[PDB]
Design a protein around this ligand. Sequence first.
Ligand code: SAH
Ligand code: SF4
Ligand code: CYN
Ligand code: CL
Ligand code: FE2
Length: 356
Amino acid sequence: MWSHPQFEKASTGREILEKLERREFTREVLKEALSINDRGFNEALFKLADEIRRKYVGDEVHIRAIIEFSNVCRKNCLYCGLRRDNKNLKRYRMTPEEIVERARLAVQFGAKTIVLQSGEDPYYMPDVISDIVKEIKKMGVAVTLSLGEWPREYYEKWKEAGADRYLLRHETANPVLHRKLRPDTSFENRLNCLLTLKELGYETGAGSMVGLPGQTIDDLVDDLLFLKEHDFDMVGIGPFIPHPDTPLANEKKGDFTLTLKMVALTRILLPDSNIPATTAMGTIVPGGREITLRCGANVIMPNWTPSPYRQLYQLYPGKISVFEKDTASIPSVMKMIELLGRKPGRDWGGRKRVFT
Ligand SMILES: Nc1ncnc2c1ncn2[C@@H]1O[C@H](CSCC[C@H](N)C(=O)O)[C@@H](O)[C@H]1O
Ligand code: SF4
Ligand SMILES: [C-]#N
Ligand SMILES: [Cl-]
Ligand SMILES: [Fe+2]
């Protein structure tokens, strides 16, 4: 028997970068990219992702204004502050008039997509959502829904009402962990919803949380390969942020750098996808969204939920700032985009097929 020494780190990193540039996306390559803790490797990975972003989605940063119109949820996900067992949290629902008029104001401020997100709140489902969507589509903008898991019939009604996109983050592709963290449902259900949305012709968004309890680097690799397999139009990635009024209150927070590497690898794997710099990235690090927009992201989703509701959509701590008026976010993100040397989107920013 003979020795078995490891290879030097910088050269291994350079070999990983070469494999990523040649698009040799083996599990071992993705695992090693996620595992290397060298600032200079990571910077090269971010620059690769940024290059691919420049080439295949360009310099426009698309603005998607989010209205979080109800924090009522029938589910009990272990990570989420809106879980039904959290009795500390004041619940609210916006009327259709409040929602439509608030959407009109975002359109006037220049948002070209309105995102309607909520807890899984049966009050609205399906017909109130259809009515709201029809009204917002008259404003000349795209509509994205992010309402959770519903029957195919509901998704079909909302498509006929005019919805363009659906964001249903897959959370984790590990089916054992998924069920542990989402005890009402399953990864199979979540995937069936994503497949139905695609079949109905939505632009479909998935994406995971990074740093969930029990999640490993091998699970993150499976998330990347899941995203690649389905060629999602949008991918929403952010860190898990523990919420004090949930069973996961005392667990580790997701790591910003690891999450940024997931965004970068997602852009490399899916060159023409729409990738937000998520709210959670801005919560975890000051300037986190700006950094993420330099590491492969091309979308920003300012929070347009009005007072007094905004502060109650408490998915995780620190999500909401109440230091400025509730109309500040769209101008703010426009200034951010200008300071980055980017441009706001000129059209609805739908996913295009320009890579291969
Ligand atoms: N503690 C937490 N940390 C980070 N993101 C969280 C979080 N709790 C929830 N989220 C994220 O918030 C997203 C929107 S939840 C609202 C939409 C819908 N009920 C749905 O579940 O799809 C979830 O997809 C999840 O990725
Ligand atoms: S993640 Fe979505 S489904 Fe789960 S508790 Fe939160 S709002 Fe409800
Ligand atoms: C979400 N941004
Ligand atoms: Cl969108
Ligand atoms: Fe988001």
